[PDB]
Amino acid sequence: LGDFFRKSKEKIGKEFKRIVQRIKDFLRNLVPRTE
Amino acid sequence: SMKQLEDKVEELLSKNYHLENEVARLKKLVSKLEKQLEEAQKDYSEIEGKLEQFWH
Amino acid sequence: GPGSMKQLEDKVEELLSKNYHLENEVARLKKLVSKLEKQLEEAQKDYSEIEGKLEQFWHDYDKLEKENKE
């Protein structure tokens, strides 16, 4: 498939960052009064 | 000349013989590279599958 | 004479036409080989860049878990 590796590199970057950000949102929600 | 045309027949027969064997080598290399690109594809999709397996 | 010379001239023309097509096929297959080699090189280069980024994240998270264990 043409541009499979380009599309998949984009998909891998978007999905991993989505996992990192949702862990970040979850942890931030555990500490409502952090500074 | 007759000798000139006989020599070019033998010359072309020899060149075409090696060109046919070169085409055979190049098509086998293309086939080898297509399989290597197919394996690289599975390695990419394997990372996608691992990232999907986080949500469930 | 002209008869035997015609058989040779025909054979040269036939072998020349096949020679030309074979040379076009060799030049076409070499371009495709170099195209596939560059695609494989770029796919392997981007894969290692993806790999290193994921390794660095795991490494940083590993030290985080160890420091937050005690």
Residue numbers in the entry:
A (entry chain E): 2 to 36
B (entry chain A): 38 to 93
C (entry chain B): 35 to 104
Quote the study's own text.
M proteins are the major surface-localized virulence factor of the widespread and potentially deadly bacterial pathogen Streptococcus pyogenes (Group A Streptococcus or Strep A). One of the primary functions of M proteins is to enable Strep A to evade human innate and adaptive immune responses. Despite this variation, the primary sequences of M proteins generally have a propensity to form dimeric, α-helical coiled coils, as verified by direct experimental evidence. LL-37 is a member of the cathelicidin antimicrobial peptide family and constitutes a major host immune defense against Strep A, as well as other pathogens.
The structure revealed a single LL-37 molecule bound to a dimer of GCN4-M87. Two nearly identical 1:2 complexes occupied the asymmetric unit of the crystal (RMSD 0.70 Å). Lastly, one more helical turn further in LL-37 were Ile20, which was surrounded by M87α1 Phe91 (d) and Trp92; Val21, which packed against M87α2 Phe91; and Arg23 whose aliphatic side-chain atoms packed against M87α1 Trp92. These hydrophobic contacts were supplemented by a sparingly few polar ones, which occurred all within a small polar break in the hydrophobic face of LL-37, near its N-terminus: LL-37 Ser9 and Lys12 formed a hydrogen bond and salt bridge, respectively, with M87α1 Glu85, and in one of the two complexes, LL-37 Lys12 also formed a salt bridge with M87α1 Glu89.
